[PDB]
Amino acid sequence: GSVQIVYKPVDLSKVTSKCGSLGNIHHKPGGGQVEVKSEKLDFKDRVQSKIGSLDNITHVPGGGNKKIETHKLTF
Amino acid sequence: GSVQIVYKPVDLSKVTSKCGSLGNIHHKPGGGQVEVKSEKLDFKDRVQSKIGSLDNITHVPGGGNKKIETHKLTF
Amino acid sequence: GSVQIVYKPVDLSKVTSKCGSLGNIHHKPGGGQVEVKSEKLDFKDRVQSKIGSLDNITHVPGGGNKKIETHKLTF
Amino acid sequence: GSVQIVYKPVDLSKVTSKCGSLGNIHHKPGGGQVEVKSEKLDFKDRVQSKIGSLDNITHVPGGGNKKIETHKLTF
Amino acid sequence: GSVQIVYKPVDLSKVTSKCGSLGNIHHKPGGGQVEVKSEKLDFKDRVQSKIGSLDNITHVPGGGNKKIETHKLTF
Amino acid sequence: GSVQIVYKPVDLSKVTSKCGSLGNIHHKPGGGQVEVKSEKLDFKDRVQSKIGSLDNITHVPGGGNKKIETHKLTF
């Protein structure tokens, strides 16, 4: 007799991530007037402060993709 | 007898990441007036401060892609 | 007898990253008036400060791509 | 005696027209397949024909604006 | 005696027309498959014919604006 | 006696027309396959024909603006 192998896996797959803000409509978003008045404050600690009328932040640590293929043929 | 191996794995796949802000419409976004008044304040460790009417920050630590193919044929 | 190997793996795949701000429309974005008034402040460690009407920041530590192929044929 | 006329009409008004398609998202609009098969047809006056999968026609004969001010001061 | 006129009409008004398609989202609108088969038709008249899977027409003859001011002062 | 006129009419108004397609996003619009087969057709007057998968037409006969001011002072 005789032996024949025809090995043809076909991969058409799509691994897709769509993260954050995609295709949105922001028509006239309005941040109102902001006022901050501070006096006599005492800090023994770290300070991180942020002040603002309109913060349109998009933050993406995620959306990463991992694809692994192992192909083994042994005769 | 005889042996024949025909080996043609085909990869047409797409690994895609779309992270942050894509295809959005920001029509007349308006950050209103900001005022900050501060006096006599006392700080004894590190200070960070950030003041502003309109921030459009897009931050992407993510969206990274990893593709591995291992192919082994052994006779 | 005889032995034959016909090894033709095909990779046409695409690894793609689209990170940050892509294809968006920012029509007349308006950062309003900012005022910051400070007096008698005392700091005993490091200070980092940022002031402004419109901050259209894009920051991308990510979006990196890693592709590994190993091919081994052995007889 | 004496006569004093102080005449200061103020117009800050807006006359505005917004006509057709404004500020929309059309996300993957898909016209499907079109097939037209015609034979032996006989025409004895004017013919107009229009064939197509996706038409995004905006037609605006309108949206015109007319402003009249007449000012008369007579002593 | 004496005579004084202080004529100060103030117009802050808006005349606004918004006609057609404004601020909509059309997510994946899909026009199905169209097939038209015709034979042996006879026309003694004008023909106007239109064939299509997705017709996203916006038509605006209207939305026009007319503002008239007459100001008359007589002494 | 005496006579005084202080004539200072102010126009800061706006006449605006926004006609056709403005500020829209068409993300991946897809015109499908079009096929037209014709034979043995007979025409004895004028023919006007148009064939196409994607027609993104904007037509504006309108949107014209007409501003008339007449000022008359007479003594």
Side-chain angles (χ1 to χ4, degrees):
Chain A
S2 65
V3 179
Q4 176 176 13
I5 303 180
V6 184
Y7 185 97
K8 299 185 178 183
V10 181
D11 186 359
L12 310 190
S13 63
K14 299 188 181 181
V15 179
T16 301
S17 58
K18 299 188 187 184
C19 295
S21 52
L22 297 96
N24 303 277
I25 305 174
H26 297 277
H27 189 87
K28 292 183 173 183
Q33 178 156 318
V34 178
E35 309 185 8
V36 181
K37 298 190 179 180
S38 298
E39 67 191 298
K40 306 179 176 181
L41 319 180
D42 176 359
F43 308 92
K44 293 190 175 183
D45 206 322
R46 292 186 182 173
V47 179
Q48 298 180 287
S49 67
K50 188 173 181 169
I51 303 170
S53 313
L54 176 54
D55 296 0
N56 205 281
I57 296 155
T58 293
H59 179 207
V60 185
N65 305 288
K66 183 172 176 179
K67 196 205 187 199
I68 304 188
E69 296 185 56
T70 66
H71 294 268
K72 184 172 177 174
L73 175 58
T74 305
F75 203 100
Chain B
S2 67
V3 180
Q4 178 177 5
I5 302 180
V6 182
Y7 182 97
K8 311 190 182 184
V10 183
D11 187 1
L12 311 192
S13 67
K14 299 190 179 183
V15 180
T16 301
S17 59
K18 300 192 185 187
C19 295
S21 51
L22 297 97
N24 307 277
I25 302 174
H26 296 277
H27 186 86
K28 291 184 173 184
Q33 177 156 318
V34 180
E35 302 181 27
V36 184
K37 298 191 176 182
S38 297
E39 67 189 291
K40 307 180 179 181
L41 316 185
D42 178 6
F43 306 90
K44 297 192 174 184
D45 211 314
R46 297 184 180 181
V47 178
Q48 300 187 327
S49 67
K50 186 171 182 166
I51 302 168
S53 313
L54 174 53
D55 299 3
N56 207 281
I57 296 150
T58 292
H59 180 206
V60 184
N65 306 288
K66 183 170 177 177
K67 194 205 186 197
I68 300 191
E69 295 186 57
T70 65
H71 292 274
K72 184 170 179 176
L73 174 54
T74 301
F75 205 91
Chain C
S2 67
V3 177
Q4 174 174 12
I5 302 180
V6 185
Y7 182 95
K8 299 186 178 183
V10 181
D11 186 5
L12 311 191
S13 67
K14 300 190 180 183
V15 180
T16 301
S17 58
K18 297 193 184 188
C19 295
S21 53
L22 298 98
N24 307 279
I25 299 178
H26 298 278
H27 185 85
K28 293 184 174 183
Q33 178 155 318
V34 181
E35 302 181 27
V36 184
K37 297 193 177 183
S38 298
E39 66 189 298
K40 306 181 177 184
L41 320 183
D42 181 0
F43 307 90
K44 292 191 174 183
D45 213 326
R46 296 185 183 175
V47 182
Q48 299 177 287
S49 67
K50 186 168 182 165
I51 305 171
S53 305
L54 174 55
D55 295 0
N56 205 284
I57 295 155
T58 292
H59 180 206
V60 185
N65 305 287
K66 183 167 178 175
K67 195 205 187 198
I68 299 184
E69 299 186 57
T70 66
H71 293 267
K72 185 168 179 171
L73 174 58
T74 295
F75 205 101
Chain D
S2 66
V3 180
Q4 178 177 5
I5 302 180
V6 182
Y7 182 97
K8 311 190 182 184
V10 182
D11 189 0
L12 312 192
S13 66
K14 299 191 179 183
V15 181
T16 300
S17 59
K18 303 189 187 185
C19 295
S21 52
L22 294 96
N24 305 275
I25 286 276
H26 298 270
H27 184 91
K28 291 184 170 189
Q33 180 158 317
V34 181
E35 305 180 23
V36 182
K37 297 188 178 180
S38 300
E39 67 188 291
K40 307 180 179 181
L41 316 185
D42 178 7
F43 306 90
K44 297 192 174 184
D45 211 314
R46 297 184 180 181
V47 178
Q48 300 187 327
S49 67
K50 186 171 182 166
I51 305 171
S53 311
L54 175 53
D55 299 3
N56 208 280
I57 296 150
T58 298
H59 178 211
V60 183
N65 305 287
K66 185 168 178 176
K67 194 205 187 198
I68 300 191
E69 297 186 57
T70 65
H71 292 274
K72 184 170 179 176
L73 174 54
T74 301
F75 205 91
Chain E
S2 65
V3 179
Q4 176 176 13
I5 303 180
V6 184
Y7 185 97
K8 299 185 178 183
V10 183
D11 186 0
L12 310 189
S13 64
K14 301 193 180 184
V15 180
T16 302
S17 58
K18 301 186 187 183
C19 295
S21 52
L22 296 97
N24 307 277
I25 299 179
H26 297 277
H27 187 85
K28 292 182 173 183
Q33 179 159 317
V34 178
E35 301 180 27
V36 183
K37 297 189 178 181
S38 298
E39 68 191 298
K40 306 179 176 181
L41 319 180
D42 176 359
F43 309 92
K44 293 190 175 183
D45 206 322
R46 292 186 182 173
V47 179
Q48 298 180 287
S49 67
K50 188 173 181 169
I51 302 168
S53 314
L54 176 54
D55 296 0
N56 206 280
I57 296 155
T58 294
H59 179 209
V60 184
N65 306 290
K66 185 173 180 174
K67 194 204 187 200
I68 304 188
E69 300 187 56
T70 66
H71 294 268
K72 184 172 178 174
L73 175 58
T74 305
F75 203 100
Chain F
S2 67
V3 177
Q4 174 174 12
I5 302 180
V6 185
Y7 182 95
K8 299 186 178 183
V10 183
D11 189 2
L12 311 189
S13 67
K14 301 195 178 185
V15 181
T16 300
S17 58
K18 299 190 185 187
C19 294
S21 53
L22 299 99
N24 309 280
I25 292 181
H26 299 277
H27 185 87
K28 292 186 172 185
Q33 179 158 317
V34 179
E35 301 182 28
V36 183
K37 297 191 176 182
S38 298
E39 66 189 298
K40 306 181 177 184
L41 320 183
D42 181 0
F43 307 90
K44 292 191 174 183
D45 213 326
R46 296 185 183 175
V47 182
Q48 299 177 287
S49 67
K50 186 168 182 165
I51 303 168
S53 306
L54 175 56
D55 295 0
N56 207 282
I57 295 155
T58 293
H59 179 206
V60 186
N65 307 292
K66 186 169 181 172
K67 194 203 187 198
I68 299 184
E69 299 186 57
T70 66
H71 293 267
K72 185 168 179 170
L73 174 58
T74 295
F75 205 101

